[PDB]
């Protein structure tokens, strides 16, 4: 694209984008959230748990730690079935903990669920277990681009950290 047709191209593209997402300019903020937010959370510490509880108060927790030792495909299928439904309370968001710990398991889960809407790595120096168990999954999500890294000081303003995490999670969602 040369520098002179760029204006016409962008104007016509903005006009024609309303044929796929009508009135997208009036709902750009809301469309930052997907229909079924599937989040995979890395991080095991007090501050990490507090931030998870604050941010995902309306979300449902999936305990991938319950699925340990089983086959990778079986675990991915079970997690997918857990995160591919809407409750009677119209709760569609799920966050998965202690999963997948493997690049192969992460890829299988993404294939079955058509990808995870977000991967959230809460990097807290007070946490030591995660880097020894879920490093391959973290690297896989970093490669795929679904990983958002939130660096948490183990001490600081909980409200400020909550606001920053909320903004980062809202911006980091994937349709």
């Amino acid at each position: 694209m040369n520098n002179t047709f760029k204006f016409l191209h962008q104007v016509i593209s903005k006009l024609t984008l309303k044929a796929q997402v009508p009135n997208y300019g009036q709902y750009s903020h809301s469309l930052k959230r997907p229909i079924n937010p599937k989040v995979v959370v890395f991080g095991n510490s007090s501050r990490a748990y507090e931030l998870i509880s604050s941010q995902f108060r309306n979300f449902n927790h999936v305990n991938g730690l319950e699925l340990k030792g089983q086959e990778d495909n079986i675990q991915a299928n079970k997690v997918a079935q857990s995160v591919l439904s809407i409750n009677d309370g119209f709760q569609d968001g799920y966050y998965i903990t202690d999963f997948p710990q493997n690049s192969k398991q992460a890829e299988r889960l993404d294939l079955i669920t058509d990808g995870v809407n977000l991967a959230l790595y809460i990097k807290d120096p007070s946490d030591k277990v995660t880097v020894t168990r879920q490093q391959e999954a973290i690297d896989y999500y970093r490669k795929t681009g679904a990983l958002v890294e939130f660096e948490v000081d183990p001490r600081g303003d909980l409200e400020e950290q909550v606001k920053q995490l909320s903004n980062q999670v809202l911006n980091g969602y994937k349709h």
Binding site: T16, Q20, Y27, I35, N58, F90
Partner: peptide, 20 residues
């Protein structure tokens, strides 16, 4: 919850509706 149930249909737009 109201926001979710209010914009659920908007957020499910056809991704591959990119003919234009």
């Amino acid at each position: 919850l109201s926001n979710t149930k209010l914009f659920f249909l908007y957020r499910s737009f056809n991704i591959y509706n990119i003919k234009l």
